[PDB]
Design a protein around this nucleic acid. Structure first.
Length: 76
RNA sequence: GGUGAAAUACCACCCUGGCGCGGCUGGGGGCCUAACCCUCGGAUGGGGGGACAGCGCUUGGCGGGCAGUUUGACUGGGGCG
């Protein structure tokens, strides 16, 4: 629970095949937001089951609650 | 606040289903017509069929018409047993 309140999130994929999670705060330091986008990049790449074959992380995007929609390239 | 398995703003990504249009390629329907076949009927020009069927290779399938072999041993014979 320590983590739960110091800096928690976690994963889970919904039906058809997607994951949902907070990777930073709005006004938060940009670089930082990058740091978290990555946090997700890693943890995810990890969880990524071995029953893959091709384009696994198909579409990865930074989007906001009630705001913009920006697909992203978490490779760099 | 509530109703529930789920909660409603609005901004996200992802499916079931029907249509917009854009690349690939699958089915196919029409004279032609110049290769091609037959051509013509008395001349290398007319005509008749025509991208077909001829025909090269590769595909799969029939296929005794043919081919080359085979189709056991024991056992008061050999077979049948």
């Amino acid at each position: 629970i320590r983590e739960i309140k110091a800096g928690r999130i976690e994963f889970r994929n919904d039906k058809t095949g997607a994951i949902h999670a907070p990777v930073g705060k709005a006004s938060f330091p940009p670089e930082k937001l990058a740091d978290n986008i990555r946090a997700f990049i890693r943890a995810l790449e990890a969880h990524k089951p071995e029953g893959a074959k091709g384009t696994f992380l198909r579409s990865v995007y930074v989007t906001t609650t009630m705001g913009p929609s920006v697909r992203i390239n978490p490779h760099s």
